[PDB]
Subunit: 250 residues, 2 copies
């Protein structure tokens, strides 16, 4: 029984180790890289539509904050349950995923319309993160219930996302265009699929990986699902622009 004075709060959980020093170094190193790779990307985009820029801009801001305030509220939530919920992550998710799926709905970027599949793809996406976040907060079996909701909404997201890649495959010309679309799909599903995997391995789930360890992994698939994927998406719209210069609209 410890003695906490006056206003100051207390909770055994908030003092838990953040991770080994080795993981701390690995995290910060990747943090700088992520900020540097995004700065070179923003330069590249600015030099040479908003879907690649805005997303990359949010990625730069995040890592900067994740380097200065990763464990400081409200980037990290210190709940009365003693668990540390990384709100910074789930907040950034809500700001990027929608744009990435909007980019997904219009891979070629030629058309000016969006189908009803996009609405469902967005709705299910935002819901997945919501449940997933509520899971990180929840405690007990409730944490499982909400994770299950995350799997259902997530499945619907991957379901419409798959149909989007397929329609995007048979739409684009059979050359390096379809080669890229496939490369985008694999980079997409692998990365996007790793998040619920890391979630289970991290402090939000069974806590195999430490907080620093979770960030090390996330930053990796953040560059995969954001920077690299968006760059591939950009390359596709360039190849599509190169095809309509040769054979015109077709």
């Amino acid at each position: 029984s410890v003695l906490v004075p006056e206003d100051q709060c207390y909770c055994a959980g908030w003092i838990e180790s953040r991770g080994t020093n080795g993981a701390q170094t690995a995290s910060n190193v990747l943090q700088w890289l992520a900020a540097g790779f995004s700065i070179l990307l923003l330069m590249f985009y600015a030099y040479q539509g908003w879907e690649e820029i805005y997303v990359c801009a949010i990625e730069m801001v995040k890592v900067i904050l994740e380097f200065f305030f990763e464990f400081k509220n409200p980037s990290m939530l210190y709940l009365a349950t003693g668990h540390r919920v990384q709100w910074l992550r789930y907040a950034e998710w809500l700001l990027t995923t929608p744009v990435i799926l909007i980019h997904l709905s219009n891979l070629t970027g030629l058309s000016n319309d969006y189908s009803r599949r996009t609405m469902g793809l967005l709705v299910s996406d935002i819901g997945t993160i919501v449940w997933g976040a509520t899971s990180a907060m929840a405690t007990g079996y409730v944490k499982v219930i909400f994770f299950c909701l995350g799997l259902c909404y997530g499945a619907n997201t991957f379901f419409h996302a798959a149909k989007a890649y397929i329609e995007g495959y048979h739409t684009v010309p059979k050359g390096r265009c379809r080669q890229v679309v496939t490369g985008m799909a694999w980079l997409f599903f692998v990365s996007w699929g790793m998040f619920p995997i890391l979630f289970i391995l991290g402090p939000e789930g069974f806590g195999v990986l430490s907080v620093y360890g979770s960030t090390v992994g996330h930053t990796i698939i953040d560059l995969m699902s954001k920077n690299c994927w968006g760059l591939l998406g950009h390359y596709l719209r360039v190849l599509i622009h190169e095809h309509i210069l040769i054979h015109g609209d077709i």
Copy 2:
């Protein structure tokens, strides 16, 4: 200096009053009404597309949870800052607003396409709530910084939402259709505008209204922006269906 034993946590803020008994009664009474009005609406919709149903379904689930677990995690977050952030509210916001704005982008419900205005309207909407939520969590001037971000994203949302109502005004026929569109716009902006107002009056802001008091107000504008607005939207699509039965497509 109090003595907290072992694992159990402590924080002066988590013990703060929830509100007067009168407000407690007013809240629960409205909670039942909201659940009853949504049940009659769900019956009405089922009897007689998904935009009105799904939204009304989430409204029913919420109030049910807000009646059983309003102050229980993770419906409410007990942060180390001593502040009680109602995550239930901000989570439900992310699940409904997008659908309501999607309904807004296709008022007549005739077309099968969505413009780029919808993407911006959604993106800015989801961002507003994110910042607004981060504000409820944040402490100090940072709470102001993030609220400002909420005003900017929110402004962009109201901006595209206004253009959507205007395009929706000159699109629908000049009869009871345009009369309804105007009634939907006023019900929309008033209600939607009240949220940041209640936020400032509530425990998240300057705390003029209690936690029970904040819920009393929110539930009111939740029925305005959700149930009543969606019902108006439904009525519009019925009137539009009545016009194309008389004068055909025009």
